[PDB]
Design a protein around this ligand. Structure first.
Ligand SMILES: CC(=O)N[C@@H]1[C@@H](O)[C@H](O)[C@@H](CO)O[C@H]1O
Length: 639
């Protein structure tokens, strides 16, 4: 196009980086009253800006040039710095850029072409996956016990499916749906069928037996979830022959049980909105690897994605961002109005859909921090005009924290939680409870007064006051509260609050020893937003470090702790998360989630003794064609 911006690393030192920004007017016309905006994920040092005035709100940066006019075929040059060790990835550059200018007194906008950043210090090393054989049974996760016989079972579309327990209804409907959707293979219910669902009360929750014989398949379970897990195994076990409307399973005996009770995946829908069809699609894929929990991250600074009828403004304002919108653009789509939200009717449809695959949905509503979208939506309710407190969040925001002294904050949170509790049948609600920015509420008159009333000597204690109100409210609504690990410090939440630990296993067990229930979600091994390889072209982020597939598989939760340890009562299970700062489409989403999710699924499900990297690679390789039939854009392990 007419306008191009080039970013170049000029200097690299310990915790410090300098950049050269060059903007080219390649149009024939001069630019008048011109200004540059771009998306950048790092905090730019404000006194470091050499040739213009920079304003930064989150990722959204506006640079006013010192020059009023930029001539045709001319260049504008600026330097800035950041406090950071070297950039390793092209995605560390500007995601998008654009300009504003005036022709004949009228405002104009143009998209700017952003050259890939010229990196000084890309990784030279590359993560190599060794060549692998293809395993005959590509089962992910690995069943804890499988015995394979020499024979095989071949069946046609008239084989029939028999069900002798109502517990298996959901699993049975799902199998048939998936065999139809994936393979176009139609099975029907037959009381005299070759595929049998049988009840076995001795089996624990989620456990199943699956035996393939020469002329029959028998599935046994004592729970709905068990039959669901069994059907996920059977989908991976079946091989469809072409030029014969037929399916083949190896004769085998499988006895299987889940290692952990909670096996979850969190999706960030606030940073970027993913449509109902996309969410459904992921949820069903989750069920394929025997995950039982979808954690829906619905609210954050960059968006509010859940319809609240009592507060229409949250989705009418807070679901949208753009230059013309109340909320500024972030990350991508700088030129347009970006957004979306889920209606309560759509959420009801997603809940029902998930339940058919044994998937519980946990909603997350972030307070008091990460609340920018809500605050812009309800200014009269949630803003104290007399607050002069200067603070910066970790995501470069100075105006994103709820005020625990305002009565409107309590009106807001009560109204939202009532509608969330009624909408979501799962007995859990996640409240955020992220650490507040340093010095927040420090110059708030309303907060100063509330400290004196409660006897608090430090402003951080207000956090606990707000969170305790949320917990008590959720308790009246019949919901247990869930929170991120910071909630455990102080007395901000009771022992009933479930803690999501991302720091370390040692911190998680510390928390468990205190009497909290906890979910392990370590940043270093379970964050699927992290890059998958060391090459600079790989999409993702790397602040927690690159996470290639081998590092993902080597994650082995609670390896050192014995099977009998009473602390394991406190460990709900494991979770993996996708943060969506730079994920705005299903192609990129697939690429990041797959194949690593299968490794996370195996960590969740399979006992450590049955885990092996080589064996895992061989099963992943035989599983790849099944993902291809579904059109999942997984990152290729062998390319
Ligand atoms: C609970 C929390 O603070 N989570 C942050 C999330 O906001 C951010 O999107 C992600 C980037 O990878 O870093 C996680 O640690």
């Amino acid at each position: 196009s007419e306008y191009r911006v080039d970013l170049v690393v000029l200097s690299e030192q310990k915790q410090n980086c300098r950049f050269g920004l060059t903007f080219h007017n390649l149009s024939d016309q001069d630019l008048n009253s011109w200004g540059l905006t771009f998306a950048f994920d790092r905090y730019i040092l404000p006194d470091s800006v050499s040739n213009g005035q920079l304003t930064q709100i989150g990722s959204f940066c506006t640079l006013k040039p010192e020059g009023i006019v930029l001539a045709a075929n001319h260049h504008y040059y600026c330097e800035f710095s950041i406090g950071s060790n070297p950039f390793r990835y092209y995605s560390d550059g500007f995601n998008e850029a654009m300009i504003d200018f005036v022709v004949d007194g009228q405002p104009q906008r143009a998209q700017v072409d952003v050259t890939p950043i010229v990196l000084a210090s890309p990784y030279r090393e590359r993560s190599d996956i060794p060549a692998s054989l293809t395993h005959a049974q590509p089962l992910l996760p690995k069943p804890n016990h499988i015995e394979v016989s020499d024979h095989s079972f071949t069946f046609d579309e008239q084989a029939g499916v028999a069900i002798y327990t109502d517990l298996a209804n959901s699993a049975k409907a799902w199998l048939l749906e998936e065999l139809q959707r994936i393979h176009q293979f139609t099975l029907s219910s037959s009381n005299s069928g070759k595929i049998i669902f049988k009840s076995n009360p001795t089996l624990d929750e989620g456990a199943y037996k699956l035996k393939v014989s020469e002329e029959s398949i028998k599935i046994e379970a004592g729970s709905s979830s068990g039959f669901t897990h069994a059907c996920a195994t059977l989908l991976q076990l079946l091989k469809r022959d072409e030029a014969t409307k037929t399916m083949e399973a190896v004769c085998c005996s499988i006895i299987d049980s889940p290692r952990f009770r909670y096996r979850g995946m969190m999706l960030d829908c606030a940073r970027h909105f993913h449509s109902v069809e996309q969410v459904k699609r992921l949820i069903n894929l989750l069920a394929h690897y025997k995950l039982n929990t979808f954690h829906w991250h619905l609210t954050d600074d960059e968006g509010w994605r859940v319809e609240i009828k009592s507060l229409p403004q949250l989705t009418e304002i807070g679901a949208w961002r753009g230059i013309d919108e109340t909320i500024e653009p972030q990350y991508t789509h700088l030129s347009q109005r970006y957004g979306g939200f889920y209606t309560q009717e759509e959420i009801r449809d997603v809940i029902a859909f998930a339940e058919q695959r044994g998937i519980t949905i946990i909603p997350e509503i972030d307070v008091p921090g990460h609340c920018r979208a809500a605050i812009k939506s309800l200014p009269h309710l949630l803003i104290e005009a007399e607050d002069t407190t200067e603070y910066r969040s970790i995501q470069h925001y100075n105006d994103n924290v709820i005020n625990p002294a305002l009565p409107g904050s309590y009106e807001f949170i009560d109204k939202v939680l009532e509608e969330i509790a009624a909408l979501f049948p799962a007995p859990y609600v996640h409240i955020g409870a992220d650490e507040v920015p340093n010095g927040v509420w420090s110059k708030s008159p309303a907060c100063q007064a509330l400290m004196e009333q409660l006897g608090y000597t430090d402003y951080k204690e207000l956090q606990g006051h707000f969170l305790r109100h949320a917990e008590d409210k959720l308790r009246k609504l019949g919901k247990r509260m869930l929170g991120w690990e910071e909630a455990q410090h102080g007395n901000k939440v009771s022992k009933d609050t479930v803690i999501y630990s991302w720091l370390s296993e040692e911190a998680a067990l510390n928390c468990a020893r205190q009497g909290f229930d906890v979910v392990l979600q370590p940043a270093q091994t379970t964050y699927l937003d992290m890059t998958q390889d060391y090459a600079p072209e790989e999409p993702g982020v790397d602040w927690a470090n690159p996470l290639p597939l081998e590092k993902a598989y080597n994650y082995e939760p609670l390896a050192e702790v014995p099977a009998d340890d009473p602390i394991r009562k406190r460990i709900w299970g494991i979770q993996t998360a996708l943060w969506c700062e730079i994920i705005n489409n299903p192609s990129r989403m697939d690429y990041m989630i797959f194949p690593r999710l299968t490794a996370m699924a195996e960590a969740c499900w399979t006992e450590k003794q049955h885990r092996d990297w080589t064996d895992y690679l061989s099963r992943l390789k035989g599983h790849l064609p099944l993902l291809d039939l579904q059109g999942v854009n997984y990152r290729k392990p062998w390319k």
